[PDB]
Amino acid sequence: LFRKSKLKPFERDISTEIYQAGNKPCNGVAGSNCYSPLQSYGFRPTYGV
Amino acid sequence: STIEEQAKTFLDKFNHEAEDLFYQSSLASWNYNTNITEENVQNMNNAGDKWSAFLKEQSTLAQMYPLQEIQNLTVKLQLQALQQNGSSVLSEDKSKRLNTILNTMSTIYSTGKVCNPDNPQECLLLEPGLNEIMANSLDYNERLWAWESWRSEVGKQLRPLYEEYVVLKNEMARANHYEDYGDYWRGDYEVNGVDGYDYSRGQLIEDVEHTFEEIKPLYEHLHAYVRAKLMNAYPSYISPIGCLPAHLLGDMWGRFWTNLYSLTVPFGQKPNIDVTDAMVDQAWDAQRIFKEAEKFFVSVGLPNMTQGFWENSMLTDPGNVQKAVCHPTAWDLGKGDFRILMCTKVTMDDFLTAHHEMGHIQYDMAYAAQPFLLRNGANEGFHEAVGEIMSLSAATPKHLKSIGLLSPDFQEDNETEINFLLKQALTIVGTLPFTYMLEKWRWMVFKGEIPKDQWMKKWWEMKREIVGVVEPVPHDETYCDPASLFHVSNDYSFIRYYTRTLYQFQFQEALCQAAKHEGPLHKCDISNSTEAGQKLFNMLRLGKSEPWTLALENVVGAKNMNVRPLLNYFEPLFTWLKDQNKNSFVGWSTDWSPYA
Numbered sequence: 001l002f003r004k005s006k007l008k009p010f011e012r013d014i015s016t017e018i019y020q021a022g023n024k025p026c027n028g029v030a031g032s033n034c035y036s037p038l039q040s041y042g043f044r045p046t047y048g049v
Numbered sequence: 050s051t052i053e054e055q056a057k058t059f060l061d062k063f064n065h066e067a068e069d070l071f072y073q074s075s076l077a078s079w080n081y082n083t084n085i086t087e088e089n090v091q092n093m094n095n096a097g098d099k100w101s102a103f104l105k106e107q108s109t110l111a112q113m114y115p116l117q118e119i120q121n122l123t124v125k126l127q128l129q130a131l132q133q134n135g136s137s138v139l140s141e142d143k144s145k146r147l148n149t150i151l152n153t154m155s156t157i158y159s160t161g162k163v164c165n166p167d168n169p170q171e172c173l174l175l176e177p178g179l180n181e182i183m184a185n186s187l188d189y190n191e192r193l194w195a196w197e198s199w200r201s202e203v204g205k206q207l208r209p210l211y212e213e214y215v216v217l218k219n220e221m222a223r224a225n226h227y228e229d230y231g232d233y234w235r236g237d238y239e240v241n242g243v244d245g246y247d248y249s250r251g252q253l254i255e256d257v258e259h260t261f262e263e264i265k266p267l268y269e270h271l272h273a274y275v276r277a278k279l280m281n282a283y284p285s286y287i288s289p290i291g292c293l294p295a296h297l298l299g300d301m302w303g304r305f306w307t308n309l310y311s312l313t314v315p316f317g318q319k320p321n322i323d324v325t326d327a328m329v330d331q332a333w334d335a336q337r338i339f340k341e342a343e344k345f346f347v348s349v350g351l352p353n354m355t356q357g358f359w360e361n362s363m364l365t366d367p368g369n370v371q372k373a374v375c376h377p378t379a380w381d382l383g384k385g386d387f388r389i390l391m392c393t394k395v396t397m398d399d400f401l402t403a404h405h406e407m408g409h410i411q412y413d414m415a416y417a418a419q420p421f422l423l424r425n426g427a428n429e430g431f432h433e434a435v436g437e438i439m440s441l442s443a444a445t446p447k448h449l450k451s452i453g454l455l456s457p458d459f460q461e462d463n464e465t466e467i468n469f470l471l472k473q474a475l476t477i478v479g480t481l482p483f484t485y486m487l488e489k490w491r492w493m494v495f496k497g498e499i500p501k502d503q504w505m506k507k508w509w510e511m512k513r514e515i516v517g518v519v520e521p522v523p524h525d526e527t528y529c530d531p532a533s534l535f536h537v538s539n540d541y542s543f544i545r546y547y548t549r550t551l552y553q554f555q556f557q558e559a560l561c562q563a564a565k566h567e568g569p570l571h572k573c574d575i576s577n578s579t580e581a582g583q584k585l586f587n588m589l590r591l592g593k594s595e596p597w598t599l600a601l602e603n604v605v606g607a608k609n610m611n612v613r614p615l616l617n618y619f620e621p622l623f624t625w626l627k628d629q630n631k632n633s634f635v636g637w638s639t640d641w642s643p644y645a
């Protein structure tokens with residue numbers, strides 16, 4: 001969901017670090033302006049097309 | 050970086066999480082409404098608790114972004130909604146006390162019951178028996194006693210609660226930057242930050258009163274005609290110049306006058322437009338009615354329904370052990386899931402109701418592309434207005450002829466149109482003075498101009514003044530008559546119905562004019578024209594992004610509500626009523642009192 005920059009063609013990235021958005025350092029913890037970059041989908045049989 | 054960029058990232062995280070949590074809560078509500086069981090009650094509570102709790106921390110964390118550093122005019126709206134929709138300023142004891150008062154008010158209204166005089170033998174409830182008696186019974190004593198009995202046993206108990214209730218709501222409002230709870234409710238229509246389209250909270254009071262000044266001549270002529278017909282029913286009780294008794298309006302509170310159509314029929318000899326027998330002869334079922342309703346939507350260019358709606362929505366009463374609430378509803382669970390819940394019978398009313406509920410579904414999908422916090426109508430009135438204009442064109446004789454329910458041999462003349470017009474007037478025109486007064490009275494008490502000891506003296510003074518209805522039995526300050534209403538006892542804003550009525554007629558004239566229609570407005574069909582659908586769809590897809598003043602100008606070319614389209618629709622009825630009021634005095638007298 002969040003990344004510092006874009007991706008070159010035919011590339012992968014598995015790095016999982018706190019995406020810092022604020023000025024102060026995240027220091028490896030979440031919270032204010034410190035969000036985890038990976039977000040999970042949600043799949044249920046009743047979802048629309 | 051900057052405030053805008055930092056705020057933008059926060060909304061992205063909130064947008065994805067909110068949709069998942071909202072979906073689970075809505076499904077729990079749907080589950081209980083169809084399968085009434087104790088565990089599903091718990092599922093509603095467990096789902097509701099998490100959704101309510103989630104909106105708390107998000108709003109609290111959203112307070113670290115000041116609103117003066119954002120100039121996009123779209124991030125500001127999303128941030129503003131969170132900071133007011135779940136944020137709490139009252140203390141813990143006051144929060145618990147306020148919730149207890151509201152819970153008590155809702156429970157006592159449902160559990161409130163009155164029953165036969167001087168007899169503790171058998172007792173009944175409001176919906177089963179009281180409504181039927183007020184709707185059909187013609188006994189003066191039975192109607193008068195039931196009107197007095199319910200108010201005494203409901204208002205008096207709720208009177209002390211209301212006095213405590215107004216205290217906390219003002220304290221919460223005064224804790225916020227709004228002047229009072231009355232100003233808190235009026236803030237929905239406020240539009241700020243856009244030049245040439247700004248709207249102020251105080252301007253609403255001026256416009257509402259201004260519109261009611263132009264509708265006064267129409268209402269009094271209807272009141273004069275209705276009073277004259279009531280003379281033929283109850284000769285002795287009613288005076289030719291006084292106000293009508295409050296217990297003879299066909300319902301419990303006089304909100305609607307539809308129950309008086311049989312008594313006040315203009316021409317009872319003429320046949321009525323009824324297709325209930327025709328539908329039975331053609332063997333129409335629940336699926337056929339909804340397919341017919343869907344077809345009408347396609348002919349104007351709007352997309353029709355998906356497979357998820359047909360498979361999931363229930364359109365018939367399950368019966369047996371499975372008991373469900375049969376009140377029609379338009380459910381929007383989000384994430385591409387749309388369902389409709391209603392118990393359907395083979396009647397014209399359900400045929401018209403099918404169009405009415407489908408209109409809300411179409412509006413929901415139009416703004417599906419908007420962010421989570423902008424998936425709503427521009428104000429509290431637009432959503433209701435959209436679902437009503439489609440029923441206006443679904444009842445036209447032309448539409449029935451095209452479908453085939455109405456025989457082509459049917460003819461139209463003087464009396465078919467006049468009878469149809471009077472049926473609509475008794476429902477729409479009658480409630481408007483009642484609607485404007487009730488919202489007004491709640492404004493002064495929240496403002497504090499009317500002291501508690503003079504709530505009832507001021508209440509009945511305006512009843513004889515504006516509505517022109519006098520109470521049949523005097524009431525002291527012990528009663529709480531306004532609390533006897535559902536909306537007042539449940540803390541719901543009531544001005545939305547006044548603005549909705551004006552909006553629907555502005556929309557219909559714009560669509561009929563766009564469809565190049567000619568003739569009387571009340572005979573208008575928009576089925577075939579694809580230009581009307583395209584223009585309407587432009588406003589629907591906007592959502593909450595644009596101010597409602599700008600949205601209205603894109604449809605009717607005006608920045609404010611107007612009453613002229615409403616008068617033109619009822620213009621043919623207006624002239625005839627003047628003819629029938631030649632020998633009848635126009636205007637009620639506030640001096641008369643039925644109880645000597």
Ligand SMILES: *[C@@H]1O[C@H](CO)[C@@H](O[C@@H]2O[C@H](CO)[C@@H](O[C@@H]3O[C@H](CO[C@H]4O[C@H](CO)[C@@H](O)[C@H](O)[C@@H]4O)[C@@H](O)[C@H](O[C@H]4O[C@H](CO)[C@@H](O)[C@H](O)[C@@H]4O)[C@@H]3O)[C@H](O)[C@H]2NC(C)=O)[C@H](O)[C@H]1NC(C)=O
Nearest residue numbers: 130134135376377378379380406409422432433436541542
């Ligand atoms: C901020 O927080 C508030 C809650 O505090 C949220 O506000 C709610 O918003 C919803 C969405 O509009 C409101 O729901 C509406 O309630 C009306 C009240 O009806 C009551 O009575 C009927 C019986 O007459 C019951 O069936 C019903 O369940 C209610 O108990 C409904 O009448 C409305 O339905 C209308 O639209 C449908 C189409 O969808 C039509 O079919 C109906 O006929 C009707 O015209 C509607 O469901 C709710 O009332 C609001 N709460 C309060 C307290 O006002 C906000 O959503 C939230 N802000 C966010 C999340 O951004």
Ligand SMILES: *[C@@H]1O[C@H](CO)[C@@H](O[C@@H]2O[C@H](CO)[C@@H](O[C@@H]3O[C@H](CO)[C@@H](O)[C@H](O)[C@@H]3O)[C@H](O)[C@H]2NC(C)=O)[C@H](O)[C@H]1NC(C)=O
Nearest residue numbers: 053054057058060061064120121122123124125418419420
């Ligand atoms: C206020 O903020 C919103 C949200 O960031 C801005 O909306 C953004 O508008 C731009 C273009 O106006 C969109 O870029 C487009 O992206 C699509 C792919 O989604 C691409 O195909 C287009 O070619 C174009 O690049 C952007 O997506 C959109 N953001 C969102 C979340 O929808 C808006 O422009 C801002 N207001 C002002 C006045 O700048």
Ligand SMILES: *[C@@H]1O[C@H](CO)[C@@H](O[C@@H]2O[C@H](CO)[C@@H](O)[C@H](O)[C@H]2NC(C)=O)[C@H](O)[C@H]1NC(C)=O
Nearest residue numbers: 348447448449450451452453574575576577578
């Ligand atoms: C919109 O067009 C449709 C089809 O072009 C019309 O449907 C016909 O209506 C006539 C009545 O004038 C019937 O005799 C036909 O049997 C209908 N045919 C079909 C296939 O539906 C429809 O009537 C038009 N809309 C309006 C309001 O007249």
Ligand SMILES: *[C@@H]1O[C@H](CO)[C@@H](O)[C@H](O)[C@H]1NC(C)=O
Nearest residue numbers: 083084085086088089370371
């Ligand atoms: C309703 O709830 C009961 C009890 O949880 C469950 O057994 C049943 O499958 C549910 N659905 C229907 C349609 O009864």
Ligand SMILES: *[C@@H]1O[C@H](CO)[C@@H](O)[C@H](O)[C@H]1NC(C)=O
Nearest residue numbers: 343347350351352353354355
């Ligand atoms: C409307 O729905 C029907 C299915 O009943 C489908 O055949 C048709 O293509 C739909 N119309 C549009 C415009 O998608």
Ligand SMILES: *[C@@H]1O[C@H](CO)[C@@H](O)[C@H](O)[C@H]1NC(C)=O
Nearest residue numbers: 462463464467621624625628
């Ligand atoms: C009835 O319609 C005819 C049209 O020929 C008109 O002359 C007459 O004035 C109408 N009467 C009423 C009461 O509307």
